[PDB]
Ligand binder design. Structure first.
Ligand SMILES: Nc1ncnc2c1ncn2[C@@H]1O[C@H](COP(=O)(O)OP(=O)(O)O)[C@@H](O)[C@H]1O
Ligand SMILES: Nc1ncnc2c1ncn2[C@@H]1O[C@H](COP(=O)(O)OP(=O)(O)O)[C@@H](O)[C@H]1O
Ligand SMILES: Nc1ncnc2c1ncn2[C@@H]1O[C@H](COP(=O)(O)OP(=O)(O)O)[C@@H](O)[C@H]1O
Ligand SMILES: O=P(O)(O)OC[C@H]1O[C@](O)(COP(=O)(O)O)[C@@H](O)[C@@H]1O
Ligand SMILES: O=P(O)(O)OC[C@H]1O[C@](O)(CO)[C@@H](O)[C@@H]1O
Lengths: 741, 112, 84
């Protein structure tokens, strides 16, 4: 559906994820029938032209998706600021016949690109006037269309929820801080880590929140006057009262109320002078700008690059320059000058000491996160001392991040003055008693531990419902925050249906979906799936490396995930699998024959490797052994095959920073909602929650949290296959198929 | 509300209309007061004999159980209204007398 | 009066509407959530004022479809006194 050309270049600050964006732009542009040019060094090579630009095919961008940074340079340029460089670049583009230009980079590159678009006509007039180009060529290329990707780790571009490469930078920060926390706990050393972040403390806040850092410095909320005494009060309170380690995060753009920079050296000198705690300073430097990009960055950058090429194809000259971004969890498309000027107004208002005005201009999500971290960081003296009771359970398989959600649920419950209980081994344990009260310090440090500490089970209540009723009466529980997987949802449904005959079960219940398969209904991303996708990504990358070593080889990878194929699909996108067979997409022998035929053709090229995924229960009959026999037999003489089963490696090790933060956020939010319902229905000094609104699944809908009730969701689940009726992510299978030849 | 004995309801078999008196009022307007009277007298069952408004009232009490505690009470409707319009019954109590009265009135009109 | 009142309301309502529509346009998409984004143009005691539509809800009798208080109640004394 195209007969024109596209230009792809990366510029500005480099951030891991660029290679995935370039791959998706190239392969999508070829898939539509356009001509794609790789402009090395960004604007520098653009001005230079000549050999620095070259036409690319499907294989030019292969075997790069797993690498950080960019392969085409992104060297900063100066002559493009001056009109002489811009006319030279326009001459080069016209000589290559590029009329559509996708620019990947930060706010400054987009500003310069939009200026260059705004004067494209005048530059071509000048080129014709000097005689370098003909009038007919200028008429053919009379217009330029732009699509911008925000490649940055600071995540300061106001029009986007998440910028390309910020999550992987958080992974690098988490690798470093987990390394530091070992020695810090060993020697009782308070550490100072200097994260990056130009004039946005997003990286600093997210790292501090996901690490439980004891103090943060960010320019959005500059510390108040005389903050040094408050530092002494908090750090003395924690370290005296059981805190073996302490961590101080400091953004490089931190400022005070007067706008003066606060040096990390000042922080070190202050802590040594006022407390004498043994301590050190560290600057992460440029480690955050490199490494293997995380799965979220690969998937996001691929989708956004696809959408940018779609925008370029369907754009017109009257349409202004637009940037493809994220709102909620979808790919929106916004005008460029609005977001640029919005960003300049925010940064200038921050410079003008109008901190509050910048706070509202940025977006409420930042302020909510800042308030959540402040509440959770250090203990405020509780005063309410309510009469309610809580029992938080882990149900289903262990999944990375469940400990984080339990931690936030306990501490938020304590801050509201409840008497939280923790029940080990799920419904099975609750039936056998095994209940104990929990204090604030009892759940400290559980943020960075994978799996579940309390223990989890697949048991359902209705077999032992009488014993559950006995334990609810003896302990007098008044709410169940059942964090778990699908069996959590089904168990809460059984308790709802059991309310009709038991008086004890007239109790508020709040589910939190946490299981790798991402199969609980009423939620888009379930807690702890991100770590599983990353573990699958790393396993498939190692297998792909082994396959490329021994040329002419294919691998059948049987991923976990139950009947849901979210995990198989997304990991296939994140590792560029040839296919991902899934229950939601029924297939027959003809599709497998076609896939074998694609493998046969592909083995003639230079890339003599392959990888096909398979959800563990994607088909009743076609076992992994069956596929191994089929591929080997029909592929005889050209390649051989091997099989693998990524078993409980999928559950992953330490939880990723996204799952850590998301667990903390769902814990606090579910607890606030639960403490809302739990007193709204208070009567005769007792709780009586019997309406269907009292049993919900806290889930991240398209934009923000929504509390769908369990009985309403009962009509949107397939209890037989154990998955929801309609999932949002089925669109991603198109991207998975289009990015393969 | 008052307690009733065996002899208090003797001889009421052959009296038309309703001795206790009836109304078209529905519960949800005064549901809080109904809850108070159920608690003070400690009632454990309502045998609501009546017409369509009886059926709708019991339906309102069923859906009122979601927030109120002492409406978790056994309820049994008995359809009694001339129109024969309560659901779940073929002949409602007291329609036969109405058909006979209509029959006698129409016979007199036909004679005229 | 009705022709003049219709013309004057149409102009002033459109001007207020353009003002708020330009106020709430940001980052390339319109978004109007605050209660002041919905109002009723009306000639108050002195001059024009824009009352939020939801705020008027406490001064409206939806049973009979009329406001709680009306200014013209004083005229009933006029009508009765002018008659014997
Ligand atoms: N006023 C401008 N006009 C044209 N180009 C500009 C302008 N300002 C910045 N640029 C472009 O930004 C490029 C690199 O500058 P920099 O701000 O460090 O990158 P970034 O986009 O990541 O912020 C420059 O090569 C230049 O082309
Ligand atoms: N853990 C923290 N990290 C960074 N800044 C903090 C932290 N705790 C408090 N502050 C700063 O000190 C201010 C007030 O301290 P706070 O703990 O809220 O006591 P108070 O109840 O008197 O307000 C806060 O608004 C914040 O700017
Ligand atoms: N690793 C991830 N996987 C999937 N979605 C993500 C990931 N990281 C961020 N997102 C999405 O981008 C949004 C950015 O969230 P953020 O701006 O930090 O505020 P908040 O966490 O309160 O929603 C997230 O809410 C989420 O929708
Ligand atoms: O995936 P589900 O059905 O939600 O249950 C969670 C666990 O169940 C699994 O199938 C694993 O099964 P087992 O742990 O019982 O061997 C995975 O999907 C996942 O680790
Ligand atoms: O000077 P450099 O190489 O850009 O590195 C420092 C800056 O790079 C950035 O990543 C800009 O992209 C900022 O975060 C940081 O302040």
């Amino acid at each position: 559906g195209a007969g024109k050309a596209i230009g792809v270049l990366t510029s500005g600050g480099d951030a891991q994820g660029m290679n995935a964006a370039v791959r998706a732009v190239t392969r999508m542009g070829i898939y539509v029938g356009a001509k794609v040019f790789l402009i090395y060094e960004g604007y520098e090579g653009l001005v230079e032209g000549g050999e620095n630009i070259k036409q690319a095919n499907w294989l030019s961008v292969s075997n790069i998706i797993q690498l950080g940074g960019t392969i085409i340079g992104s060297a900063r340029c100066k002559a493009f600021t001056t009109r002489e460089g811009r006319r030279a670049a326009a001459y080069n583009l016209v000589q290559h016949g590029i009329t559509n230009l996708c620019v990947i980079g930060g706010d400054g590159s987009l500003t310069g690109a939009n200026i260059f678009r705004s004067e494209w006509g005048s530059l071509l007039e000048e080129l014709v006037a000097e005689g370098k180009i003909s009038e007919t060529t200028a008429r053919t290329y009379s217009h330029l269309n732009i699509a911008g990707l925000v490649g940055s780790i600071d995540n300061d571009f106001c029009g986007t929820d998440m910028t390309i490469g910020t999550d992987s930078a958080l992974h690098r920060i988490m690798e470093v801080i987990d390394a530091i926390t070992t020695t810090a706990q060993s020697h009782q050393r308070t550490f100072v880590l200097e994260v990056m972040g130009r004039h946005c403390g997003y990286l600093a806040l997210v790292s501090a929140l996901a690490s439980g850092a004891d103090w943060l410095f960010i320019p959005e909320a500059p510390p108040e006057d005389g903050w040094e005494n408050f530092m002494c009060e908090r750090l003395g309170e924690t370290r005296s009262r059981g805190s073996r380690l302490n961590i101080i995060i400091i953004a490089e753009g931190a400022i005070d109320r007067n706008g003066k920079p606060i040096s990390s050296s000042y922080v070190k000198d202050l802590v040594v002078q006022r407390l004498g705690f043994d301590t050190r300073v560290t600057v992460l430097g440029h480690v955050q700008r490199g490494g293997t990009p995380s799965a979220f960055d690969r998937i996001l950058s691929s989708k956004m690059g696809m959408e940018a090429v779609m925008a370029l194809l369907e754009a017109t000259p009257d349409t202004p320059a637009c940037v493809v971004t994220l709102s909620g969890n979808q790919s929106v498309r916004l005008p460029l000058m609005e977001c640029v000027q919005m960003t300049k107004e925010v940064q200038k208002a921050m410079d003008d000491k109008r901190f509050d005005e910048a706070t509202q201009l940025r977006g409420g999500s930042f302020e909510n996160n800042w308030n959540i971290y402040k509440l959770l960081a250090h203990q405020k003296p509780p005063k309410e001392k309510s009469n309610f009771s809580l029992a938080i359970l882990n149900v289903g398989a262990p999944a990375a991040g469940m400990n984080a959600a339990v931690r936030s649920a306990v501490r938020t419950g304590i801050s509201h003055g409840h008497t939280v209980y923790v029940v080990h081994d799920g419904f099975e344990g609750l039936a056998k008693g095994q209940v104990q009260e929990v204090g604030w310090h009892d759940v400290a440090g559980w943020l960075g531990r994978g799996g579940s500490m309390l223990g989890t089970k697949r048991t359902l209540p209705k077999g032992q419902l009488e014993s559950i009723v006995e334990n609810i009466r003896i302990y007098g529980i008044h709410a169940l925050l059942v964090v778990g997987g699908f069996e959590a949802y089904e168990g809460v449904l059984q308790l709802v249906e059991a309310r009709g005959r038991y008086e004890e079960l007239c109790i508020v219940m709040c589910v939190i979906p946490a299981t790798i398969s991402n199969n609980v209904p009423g939620t888009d991303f379930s807690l702890g799936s991100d770590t599983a996708v990353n573990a699958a990504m790393e396993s498939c990358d190692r297998i792909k490396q082994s396959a490329s070593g021994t040329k002419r080889r294919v691998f059948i990878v049987e991923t976990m995930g139950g009947y849901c194929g979210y995990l198989a699909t997304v990991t296939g996108i994140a590792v560029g699998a040839d296919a991902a067979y899934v229950f939601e997409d029924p297939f027959n022998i003809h599709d497998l024959k076609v896939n074998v035929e694609h493998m046969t053709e592909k083995m003639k090229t230079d890339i003599q490797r392959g990888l096909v995924l398979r959800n563990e229960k994607c088909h009743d009959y076609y076992t992994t052994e069956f596929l191994y026999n089929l591929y080997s037999s029909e592929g005889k003489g050209v390649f051989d095959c091997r099989t693998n089963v990524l078993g409980h490696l999928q559950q992953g090790g330490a939880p990723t920073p996204f799952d850590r933060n998301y667990g903390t956020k769902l814990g606090v939010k579910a607890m606030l909602w639960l403490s809302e319902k739990l007193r709204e229905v208070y009567r005769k000094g007792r709780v009586f929650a019997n309406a269907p609104d009292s049993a919900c699944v806290i889930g991240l809908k398209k934009k923000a949290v929504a509390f769908s009730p369990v009985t309403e969701l009962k009509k949107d689940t397939d209890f037989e296959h154990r998955m929801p009726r309609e999932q949002w992510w089925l669109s991603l299978r198109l991207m998975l198929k289009m990015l393969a030849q």
